[PDB]
Design a protein around this ligand. Structure first.
Ligand SMILES: CCCCCCCCOCCOCCOCCOCCO
Ligand SMILES: CCCCCCCCOCCOCCOCCOCCO
Length: 414
């Protein structure tokens, strides 16, 4: 989440508690949809998430990922029935995606042998919300919305023998496949996990579930409105699909094995958000928001792989603490049809294929509308780059850019 939804909400540091954010409010604060211009709003957009990562060896070897992006489409329509606003939409998004290739050290056996396995990641989450909004009384504005989330997980991951040995020795790695493959992998081999299938027959690790939120707004003054919204815990099942567990010996021998894999217990925590937007002049508006993701309340993960020959189970325990986000955003009416936006956000061990989220983000946004019904919104969010290190004694450097773009046509009732 953190960064909100939509070209304007993202160009404004992820702020969204109480100002027109567009059709994307269907996920953030649907109560803001009542601030929409008279009529019905059709919205179309594209999300692109560039990622730059460099991981280094204890020998000066590097594996980098960034070396063409995933583009997520965004369709949605909001309708006005008197005081009501009803809206539906499909919101595609990545939430992980790395590609280190197969010529890197991450693809070598605890031993030095260069295997040909890739090392990559890709998480895709679709959100198709159904929601409404009621302007209950000129002052407050009710707003609810249910979801339906579709998650897909692509994985390509090699673990040199020392890593499996410690998992195994820690008791975090179990299964009947331990005693049968252990001799093959040995001292200088590894194990590779692959989740490469797509869609449906394909296998493809995915899950479908529900989700939802509700919020509200209030205008104490004539240019200062306040907002808040509560998000429900994502009730997603286990991600399940086909996976190939493949053992590699000290001389590069490969012993693949197809089966089922389940990535158990993970949802997405409930979040509480409080904020306020204020207009100074009349062409300049400023917004500040404070978000609280209840990660710490996720006590309820694993990875269960199972085949005809046996299975392997990995028990990797979180250690989660609620996170807090502080965001501020600016919008400026520079022309009669050109707005300028900008903002900042503030958040608060390794594994190169699943990078941790970034602490800070600096965004820029712009709006240009040809008519009073046709608008184009742009946004560019930079996830500030942070360094961080841990045989495999690694060090990682990770930054991230974000482009969102959408065309917004306003229709009129006849
Ligand atoms: C996916 C299964 C991963 C399980 C592999 C565990 C591998 C861990 O290390 C085992 C190391 O011990 C084995 C020794 O090397 C083989 C030598 O031959 C032994 C008899 O003298
Ligand atoms: C909401 C995002 C959830 C995304 C989860 C993707 C990460 C889940 O685990 C993927 C690993 O399962 C396959 C391999 O076996 C585990 C590897 O050993 C662990 C590293 O220390």
């Amino acid at each position: 989440d953190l960064e909100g939804y939509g070209a304007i909400s993202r160009a404004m540091g992820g702020t969204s508690s109480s100002y027109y954010t567009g059709n994307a409010a269907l996920i953030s604060n649907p109560a803001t949809l009542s601030f929409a211009p008279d009529g019905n709003q059709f919205e179309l957009g594209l999300d692109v998430v560039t990622t730059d990562i460099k991981v280094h060896d204890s020998h000066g070897a590097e594996a980098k990922s960034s070396t063409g992006p995933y583009v997520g489409p965004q369709l949605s329509y909001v309708a006005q029935l008197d005081d009501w606003r009803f809206g539906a939409g499909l919101f595609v998004s990545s939430g992980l995606g790395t590609e280190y290739g197969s010529k890197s050290f991450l693809s070598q056996t605890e031993n030095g042998i260069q295997t040909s396995f890739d090392n990559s990641s890709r998480l895709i989450v679709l959100r198709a919300p159904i929601g409404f909004s009621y302007q209950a009384t000129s002052k407050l504005t009710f707003g609810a919305s249910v979801d339906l989330v579709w998650t897909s997980l692509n994985l390509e991951l090699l673990l040199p023998s020392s890593q499996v040995g410690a998992l195994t020795a820690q008791g975090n790695l179990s299964g009947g496949l331990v005693p049968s493959l252990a001799g093959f992998v040995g001292t200088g081999g590894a194990a590779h996990f692959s989740l490469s299938r797509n869609s449906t027959a394909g296998g493809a690790v995915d899950a479908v579930g529900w989700g939802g939120r509700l919020g509200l707004t209030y205008k104490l003054t004539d240019n200062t409105v306040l907002g808040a919204m509560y998000n429900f815990k994502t009730s997603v099942g286990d991600l399940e699909g086909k996976a190939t567990l493949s053992a590699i010996s000290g001389d590069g021998a490969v012993l693949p094995l197809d089966g089922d894999i389940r990535v158990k217990n993970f949802e997405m925590p409930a979040s509480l958000t409080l904020g306020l937007a204020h207009q100074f002049n009349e062409r300049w508006v400023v917004a500040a928001d404070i978000k609280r993701a209840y990660w710490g309340d996720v006590m309820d993960m694993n990875v269960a792989f199972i085949s005809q020959l046996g299975g392997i189970d990995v028990a990797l325990p979180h250690r989660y603490q609620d996170i807090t986000v502080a965001s501020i955003g600016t919008a400026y009416k520079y022309n009669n049809d050109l707005t300028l936006r900008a903002g900042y956000s503030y958040a608060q061990l390794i594994l190169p294929v699943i990078p941790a989220y970034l602490k800070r983000h600096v965004t820029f946004g712009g709006e240009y509308d040809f008519d009073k019904d046709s608008r184009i919104n742009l946004a560019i969010s930079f996830g500030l780059r942070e360094r961080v290190q841990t045989t495999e004694m690694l060090r990682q450097s990770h930054s991230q850019i974000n482009a969102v773009v959408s065309y917004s046509k306003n229709f009129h009732h006849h």
